[PDB]
Design an enzyme around this catalytic site. Structure first.
Site: not given
Ligand code: FE2
Ligand code: FE2
Ligand code: FE2
Ligand code: FE2
Lengths: 124, 124, 124, 124
Positions: A111, A47
């Protein structure tokens, strides 16, 4: 519309929101964009923020200009497994822009698991 | 080998050589890379630095890690012709690296007409 | 919102709009994206398509995934002047995506003087 | 020298070496580059090829031109964990190059835990 996949918000409560700040020195505009200013964003192999892009739409003009793109490419990955390299690139981007124009600056960030994020600020 | 297309040199006399400078603050290593420190490099629609990449090979390890990549995407182009937008992105790149390791940092830069350029420095 | 700088439309009129086409072969989805399918888009040092990005929002999911990015980096520039190298990279991007999911594919392209352009298609 | 971090070799024995193949259709040169032709290469959240770049040094010239760059950005990551999205981008890059010149083509690829890899073929 791709805009249906882009999220926005208050960077005070939302950690994914790219925060844009700038300091105009002469014909030089120094722009700082980062993700996780108040709320820290994870940076692990699984992540992490991949990149931040900065755009500039001059006041009264019809076409936005991409000012730059910063890719954060290290996230702890190594032959010894995820999060073992001790090498991480933080989601902080700096752009030195040369212009005497005014307008609006936009930041677009991504992201690896939470999609696209945006923010904007007026360049006075 | 591709290395036969990559040039290097002293940035005190060669404007293309990417100059690497850093400041270590805890586990944070702030790296600054720029082309044209001494002899400024042109930034026109016809001639400009496209990007700067930063790599890090930790001491004693076998695999280099790409720390980041910064693309300078504005070079004066507009519907009114080359060099008319008054919007230019200077070849100055900043990378915030989180690591406690030591090693060698490499910078790879590309000029749209003068090919690839490199430089390196030891990360103490 | 950045969406205010992104244009869209039919590729049968605007030689910009990125055209998305794909061929599913089991788990493999081969995607082709290009700008200027009807009327070719200029590709000169002064006017050219910089890149094409492909995104994928799986059916019923909340976060979009960037599938890939293709940068077209040669546009005729050389030490002899703009449009003199005889080396141009056409705005045609291919992506081989491995997935069994269905959803929506989005293409985002950037023209150096005409801003951002988008288009999308359902992936069955 | 950054070349000290770049590996090369036999594609029939090293599942990392980028394989370059092309076809000349008049003024267009269609180039295909892939890692894992002979021995497919892992493509997991923890181990994957990040991108492939193509360069071209025309015969008798002094400056290499970057023809393109393809980033493979999806590697199974999702809010559910590593390797759970069922969305992977295969390390196969296509470039459509418009040129009548001959010379050498170079491919530069980056694995995320294995560093930089290169290969080159003569463009006739
Ligand atoms: Fe994130
Ligand atoms: Fe130059
Ligand atoms: Fe255009
Ligand atoms: Fe590998």
């Amino acid at each position: 519309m791709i805009s249906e996949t882009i999220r926005s918000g208050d960077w005070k409560g939302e950690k994914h929101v790219p925060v844009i700040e700038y300091e105009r020195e002469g014909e030089l505009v120094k722009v700082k964009v980062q993700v996780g200013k108040e709320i820290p964003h994870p940076n692990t192999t699984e992540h992490h923020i991949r990149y931040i892009e900065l755009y500039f739409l001059p006041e009264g003009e019809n076409f936005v200009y991409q000012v730059g793109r910063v890719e954060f490419t290290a996230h702890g990955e190594s032959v010894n497994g995820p999060n073992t390299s001790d090498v991480y690139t933080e989601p902080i981007a700096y752009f030195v822009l040369k212009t005497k124009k005014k307008g609006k600056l936009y930041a677009l960030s991504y992201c690896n698991i939470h999609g696209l994020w945006e923010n904007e600020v007026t360049l006075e």
